[PDB]
Amino acid sequence: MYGDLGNKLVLEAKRTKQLYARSNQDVNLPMYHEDIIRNILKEVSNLRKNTEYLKEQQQLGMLDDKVAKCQYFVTLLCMERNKRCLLAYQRLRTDILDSMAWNNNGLDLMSSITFSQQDTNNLSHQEQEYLKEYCDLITDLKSGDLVDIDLSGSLVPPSDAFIDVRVLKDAGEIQTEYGVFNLIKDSQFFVQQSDVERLIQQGYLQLI
Amino acid sequence: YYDIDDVLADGTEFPCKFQYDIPGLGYNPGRPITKNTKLSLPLWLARILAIVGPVPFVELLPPDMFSTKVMNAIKTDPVALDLHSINSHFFSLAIKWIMLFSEKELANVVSELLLQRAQELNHHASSTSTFLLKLEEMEKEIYKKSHESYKDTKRWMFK
Amino acid sequence: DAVFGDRVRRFQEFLDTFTSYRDSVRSIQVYNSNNAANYILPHRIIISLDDLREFDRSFWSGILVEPAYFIPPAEKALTDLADSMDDVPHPWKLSFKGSFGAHALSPRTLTAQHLNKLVSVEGIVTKTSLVRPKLIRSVHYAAKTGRFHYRDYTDATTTLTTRIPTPAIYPTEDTEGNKLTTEYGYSTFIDHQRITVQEMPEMAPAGQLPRSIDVILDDDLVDKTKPGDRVNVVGVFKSLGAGGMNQSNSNTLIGFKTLILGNTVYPLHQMLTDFDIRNINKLSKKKDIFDILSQSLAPSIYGHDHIKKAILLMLMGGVEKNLENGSHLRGDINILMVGDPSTAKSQLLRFVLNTASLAIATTGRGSSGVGLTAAVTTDRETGERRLEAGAMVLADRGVVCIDEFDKMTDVDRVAIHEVMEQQTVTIAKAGIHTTLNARCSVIAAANPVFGQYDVNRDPHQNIALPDSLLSRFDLLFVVTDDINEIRDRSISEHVLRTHRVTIPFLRKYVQYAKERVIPQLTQEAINVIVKNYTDLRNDDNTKKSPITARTLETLIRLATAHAKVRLSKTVNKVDAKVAANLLRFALL
């Protein structure tokens, strides 16, 4: 009853892992809960308020009682508990997030972060600032190599090395890089793994 | 810690009675809590109250889950025993309580139970039925990981 | 079969190291000899499966996997240890507690992987086949050649293991040609029964029909369970009978009916010591106790202090007085409650029931007629006309409850007249012709006899159940939930507070009070109740009705009851005043 709201919150955190697990991974997190954590923050503010109040009270009334210690001990733990929840949730949220910023940006010619992440505005803007700052953070890693990467893609090794892509209602032709593949619905291109990696992440290509 | 299983593991209630009186009850209008009151506490706070004292603040009365009836029943047929009903956390939990109370006796017991489940879980690692329903949450997670390695290695086996 | 010997020498060791069972066997051997020195205990030693794993896992897995080869050598070993006990001046039985299980199964999940393996079934037991003897040891006497001659009969359920069937009849001139008379009462008969077990109704999956299997209960186990009881049986799961393969007709495909032998049958769901009686004794002197007691009944119910007072005064009940060579005057007090619904009238009665020490509850119509044996007809069986106690015979010396007392057919009421005052039941049925005694105390709750006009409506025409009945009941209490506005708010507040000198000492307080001691009667009081009574007749017969000598009787019963509450060896004037009070609130 004391710290249990955090147990319920992480209990809810669990279900997003369930949605990232088997899964199938489309992202589409329901929302970030600002309300329930606001409840948590009001509860914890309550706590630390009574804490500094009693911290004033030992200075006068309690007179360093053996019992007093407990309040600064036990209730202190509760603060930690909320923290233990609040970060555990939060890191989970960053884990479901940064990976998404990994596997697709997105990809050639990124060329900008847009239309991605169906959560969009529904997810908190505090995370989105972190996010845009994070893909800005990875643009520098993109700019060191020079390898080249091409890192966001090709988690799965090339074979061999030409494939066949069957158009999937995409228009097209938007293939400007390397060559004008001239995208055309109902058209399969006997194209090398090279531009396939880049174009398959967008949603144009279908069968590898 | 950050993983959900641990922070959820700390959420479980234990029957721990107070060694001492503590006015300023945070649970309601006592105001103090009379000595030797039996109050259920989650593990997170109760964990370091047994250490800090040279007499500790709490007795640590053994949880109903660890009742010697149970620790006996798990020595018969673990494979048919239902863990998911009792807690459901066991290994995530029991691992803490074995260190907290520093009990040697049951190590040899649970160290056995977990082999006996697993010699069964390599059996459902091959491609459920009812059984998948009675695993402990964390154990269950390992079942995902194994079943996925197998499934993926089979899907690689052909085309 | 040296291996059966191995099983015996192996089970030997298990006992006496550790010795934790041996003390119980010794206890069994001693207690019966103590009954031999006096001026019943089944001989079986419960074996906790708990302990078996510590010694040998090999022998542990066996009792579950193949009990036919294991339980009987362990058993012969237990007898063998019981004979080395002390001393001279029977097969016994194993039990198997557990430490379940595997083998944990409800009856719905069973057959065949669980067959020929120990099993703990659980479910409802019906219909409980009727208890019957079963022959085992044949015993005879030869003359004049003498000696002593015996045969041993092996049935289908003998031991565990299958054996070449001995039955049937009697040996009758075993060689040489000497006559053999059956010796009855030396020869051994183990009782025998079977009871089928249905799976628990609440764990039933679908509209799919319930699957029950039958359990044979050997020896002591017999008559240990009425039907409809939650039961966890244990036993070896046995398939007996040919499937039809025995003969040469085939018949059909149906076959091998199965059942469980033995074994345990664990069911599942006063003492005043030194100090208690002292608590009473201390508490008896305090002058205000009656009100506290009267409040102790109703944690959940507001006011009605008068009525609660009444229910106590029924629990105690005016002793009983049987004159020399003459009829006896009724001791106990009967009560009725009438008021609009929500009056807790049906809620009160259950709490009457719990702490009541007995008795049976009956609600409207009804059964078993409540009256006499009811002359149950017809047959049951063969056509023989039999009868059984009505609904006030098995409740003797107790508190009968009646709910929706108005809705009961007049036919019954006619009998209730005979029950209440007269105090006896008379059955001329067919038949067994007897006057048998039901001296029960009685409570009844009835509605407002049509039309909520219970509050405003006349002193008569409101009750709906004339006439003598109205009198028979010592006290008629009215319960119109009518404000009394300032009374409504208070009640609401009370209920709210609820939505969030004890209860276990009450009945203990009561029994001692009941058999000790009867207060008799005293000339302190009599003039009071006489004044009162005469007042009642003379003034109330203008005010209201009914009033008769009956009222007077009631006056005395109440006086004596409140005397019991005071624990006083005598009746007092104060008590008389109390009786006065409650009979007043009855009337006004």
Next chain:
Amino acid sequence: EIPELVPVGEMPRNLTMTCDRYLTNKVIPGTRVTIVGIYSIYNSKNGVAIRTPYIKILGIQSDVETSSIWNSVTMFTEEEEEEFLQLSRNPKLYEILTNSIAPSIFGNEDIKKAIVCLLMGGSKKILPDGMRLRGDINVLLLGDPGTAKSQLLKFVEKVSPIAVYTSGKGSSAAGLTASVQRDYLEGGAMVLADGGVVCIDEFDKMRDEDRVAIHEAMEQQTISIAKAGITTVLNSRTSVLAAANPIYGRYDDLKSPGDNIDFQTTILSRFDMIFIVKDDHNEERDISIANHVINIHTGNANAMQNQQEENGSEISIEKMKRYITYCRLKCAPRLSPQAAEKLSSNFVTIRKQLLINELESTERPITIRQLEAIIRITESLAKLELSPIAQERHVDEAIRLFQASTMDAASTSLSEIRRFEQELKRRLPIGWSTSYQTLRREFVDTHRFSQLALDKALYALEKHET
């Protein structure tokens, strides 16, 4: 064999089949299947020779859809938690649900909402001592036909996760709920449908002996059966939804609102939400319903509105059920203190005001049971939002809703038949040789007297004092 083909005019034959080993208990009775197996014959003396046919099965395969199991899993899938928790975020969630139940049925919004708050269960307390309060409530649809209530029940029966529609007197061979049959509990409505919804009709037309059983059951959720060799005391967690049929029509409203069911209102006292309804006709509404039916016949294409409601907003009702199961098992709601005191004010105003109303002996009621009902509605609706905690406005709905129920609790005679005086007088000073019998012969061939009519006029005159 299947009813589509080929019954013709004759009852369809049934071949006896023996499954064995691992195919056993593979199929729930009532599900269509396709068997394979050998075909063969067994003897079974019943000449000459006449051996009877059976089909050994190897091996059985059920149809893809038809209760293959397990359609009832206390956990469901994942994406379902996702989309549920997406539905909990709707402001019009309550409102859109109240539009799911009766796509076909028009009007009746109070009933329409009441069903919702019924299905969702309520506060359930196991608190010591053994006494346990329960959920969830009860609903009465009683009124003249055209109310669609008897159809509406068919709908609730569909939606509710586990439900049994029994109108009786039960039907047909299965006793009204829990039933004693001999080889034990034979399992019935109150039983076979334990832990959920039960739908009853002709509630006033039910037998006596089991009527007792019901009355005692609905409050304490447990029914005790002492029949023969089984004295069992089981448990019915069901919440009864009953539709009674009122007598003589509109005059019964002119009559005291209670007094309808048998001679006793106690039934109506046990029941928490009583809705008097009627097949009211308004040219606006009547043209609405009519035009709707004209649309229904052909050209047929109206039932699509539900489907675009599904695309845009509304719930498929195949999902609603899963949802109800979800909310039902997951979370158990609890009321807030200010809401509590608010309801205290509610109920004391009720008690006081309506007492004042009954100073005149105005014939009609108020029980703390009704309060408890109001509570269970609040928790039900709280369990709609899914929130672990109640709110004030949340209840503010409930008070008014139940207020509509009170309005239902609130709502001359020719005396022709009641003119039993003529007979009682100048006919029979001794009343004998007449009684209920005389009234018949005298009113039997007079084109005239109903049982309730005869008793009413009798009870009337009994009471009237004539």
Next chain:
Amino acid sequence: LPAHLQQTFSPEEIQFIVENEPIKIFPRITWQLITTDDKALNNMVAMRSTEVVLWIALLLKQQSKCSIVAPQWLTTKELDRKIQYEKTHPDRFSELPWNWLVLARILFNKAKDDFHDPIHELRGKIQDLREIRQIKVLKGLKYLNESHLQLDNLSLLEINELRPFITEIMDKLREIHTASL
């Protein structure tokens, strides 16, 4: 963020690895190329065996410009001595190329027509040697203790399939036991 798997290798990744093993080839051909890691070759002579890395043999086999040699250990008459030697030492897993599963998948997709008696034989043989060996692993897995195991000679794929399982419940098992002293 590798996402999947991540602690264990991917089934594909172990082929990605094994294709780095060289094996002999029979080139039809008679630039340069230095590439990087190859070191080979002077222009390959037709009807002359030579040693090259796998992924290039496979690459040049899709164009059917080269005929891969069968490994001396891939034969049914050869496998026979191996299952014979395997049934008779229920404890040890014998002698394995360590890639044999994955080469058994790869060389059968394309090169199949090059093998002598490839049809309906060897696949029957290795699907078997991949049976009794697997159950022998599951029955050798009961003896689990921390910290040691002899997995002796065991395929890379066989390692990879059961890895999360073993190295997880070893991390529940050893975790109580280290910590209880």
